[model samples]
Target: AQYEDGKQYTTLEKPVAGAPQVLEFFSFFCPHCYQFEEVLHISDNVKKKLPEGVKMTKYHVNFMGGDLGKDLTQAWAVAMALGVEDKVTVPLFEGVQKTQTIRSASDIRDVFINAGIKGEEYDAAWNSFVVKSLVAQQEKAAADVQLRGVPAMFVNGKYQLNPQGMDTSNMDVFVQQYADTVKYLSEK
Candidate 1:
């Protein structure tokens, strides 16, 4: 069932562009995603194992955090457009999931500002048509999959992998298997 239907994975109706990519559906308010990023550093470890040229993309699901979901996705796009995701993701996650400091869009703006991004730069990125379109696209992608949860991952935009059964106790093995699985599915 490598290419056929399977239990561990599902195929997308319209495969996303950017072949050889790992598209992750997550939310900053997700506790598990916070653990994955801050505690386990799954993305960093997985990235080291992925083959050259494989893109790892994050899509912030626009259905969580009650009313802040869409706005949070917009902020994510803002950070990406400004090339400051590295400086924003963790702080945003902490503000939302840990400290509970982010309530409004302005709170997210403050996070960017504290991260060294100028207020005007953050405002421009937040208001730009490009960032708005990116947020919309992210929402559409999540809807296409009928995604109901965070931390879902897709390989090459075709195979969706669930982290449910993975053993998380041994992080090294978990990372190895997860990375290998992505590589295995990435092959055409």
Candidate 2:
């Protein structure tokens, strides 16, 4: 998606380092984000084929209102800051989807602990500068990108994909197409 300068492209003005960056914009409460989880895993496998220096990052969107939303935002920031993103991602996802009680910060923390993240590390990271900075950065990014919904993506700050914008029948196809697009962009 083409973005107007000073508007949709604002927060992403910082130059992406390394070869290229693949960004996935998501939200914890979105059902589609859950469905896209499997696809994201598959995409990670394809990422292994890319040349060194190419990297992918996830930016969680937090437009939803209330304490639940804030908790998820904080959770993601903490996980990223603790360098436990990989450690917490799947477990957090599973925690939310599997149990009725997995709907708050404490619940999410339980999942993190079960996944082996130390409580001290979790606490420290939750209040760390890195996590706070990431949360602020993502908030700015959401404004600049003018995101319409969750599960959006951007490649090297040049291309965008919003599968949610497509017809329901084409969701799977669009995701696959996006994976191919990522591969093509990575090769470039």
Candidate 3:
């Protein structure tokens, strides 16, 4: 398909290094993000379709849920710092979205603890410089893009996929198109 700027995707005002990197901006509070991650398994599908050495990254957006949004982003940063994202992401999502059990930073801490991370370990990561910087960076990126929505995909920190520009009626079609867009944009 012939993709055009401001149509299929929008170019960033300040483009980052055009590496084979894909950054996904999402929030646990977002239903569509949850659908993309849990129901459609977009990450798994897209990862397999991408070329070698492509770096896929996730940035938890901090706009929804007010203070809870910031807390969740901090929690996500801690998970990344401790290398426990695999153990923490889904449960946190379920806790907030499915179970409605997570309501604060403390609740988020419990998720890490339940996932085999010691409470002290969680605390350390939570207060660590790395995690703080990560959270700050993620927050800055969300702001920089003037993000108005979640589950936004950016390739090489430059091109953002336009949801309105693509067909999202079918999961298979969406995944193919999404992967194809990243693959195409990454090459530029």
Taking all chains together, the TM-score of candidate 2 against the true structure is 0.75
Candidate 2 error regions (>4 Å): 1-20, 39-42, 162-175, 185-188
For residues 130-170, write the lDDT of model 3, one tens digit per residue: 98998988887777668889888888778998867888899
TM agreement with the true structure for every prediction: 0.88, 0.75, 0.91
RMSD (CA, angstroms), candidate 1 = 2.5
TM-score comparison, 1 vs 2, better candidate: 1
Backbone clashes under 3 angstroms, per model = 0, 0, 0
If ranked by TM-score, best first, what sequence of candidates would result?
A: 3, 1, 2
Clashing pairs in 3: none
Model 2: per-residue lDDT, tens digit, 1-188? 43233322222444444313777777766767777774445356436655666677787777763677678888888877767777877676666665556766788889788888889888888878888888897776666667778767666765565343333466556555556556665444
Best by lDDT: 3
* 1-188 per-residue lDDT for model 1 (tens digits): 53334544667888767543777888998888897788677777767777776678877887787778888999988987888989999899999988999999999999999999999998998999999888877887777667898888888768887566455788777766666666667665
lDDT of 1 at 71: 89
